[PDB]
């Protein structure tokens, strides 16, 4: 949606601390999600099914 609009005007809003906190929290959430996804077993399931193939 408007995430690209946020990316276009990053320099003009990075001076606000709220935006910095929001960006850091989003990056942390994405990192934690990726960790969970690649350790819980979802990827293992995909590999298992491809191995069967």
């Amino acid at each position: 949606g408007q995430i690209v609009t946020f990316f276009q005007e990053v320099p003009h809003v990075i001076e606000e601390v709220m935006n910095i906190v929001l960006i850091a929290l989003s990056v942390l959430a994405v990192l934690k999600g990726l960790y969970n996804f690649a350790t819980c077993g979802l990827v293992g399931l995909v590999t298992f099914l491809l191995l069967c193939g």
């Binding site: 609009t5 946020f6 929001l22 994405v30 969970n36 819980c40 077993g41 979802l42």
Partner: protein
């Protein structure tokens, strides 16, 4: 009573002028992504 609403809405207007909506959307979607991750952790999906 109009004074109270005008002040609270001025706060909202300033926040909207300083924080892009794209960042709010990114934060919400990242939180939802992480929550789905912790769900798939709690369900102990096995390879078997």
């Amino acid at each position: 009573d109009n004074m109270i609403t005008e002040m609270l809405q001025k706060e909202y207007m300033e926040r909207q002028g300083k924080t892009p909506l794209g960042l709010v959307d990114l934060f919400v979607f990242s939180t939802s992504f992480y929550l789905i991750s912790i769900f798939l952790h709690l369900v102990k999906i096995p390879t078997h």
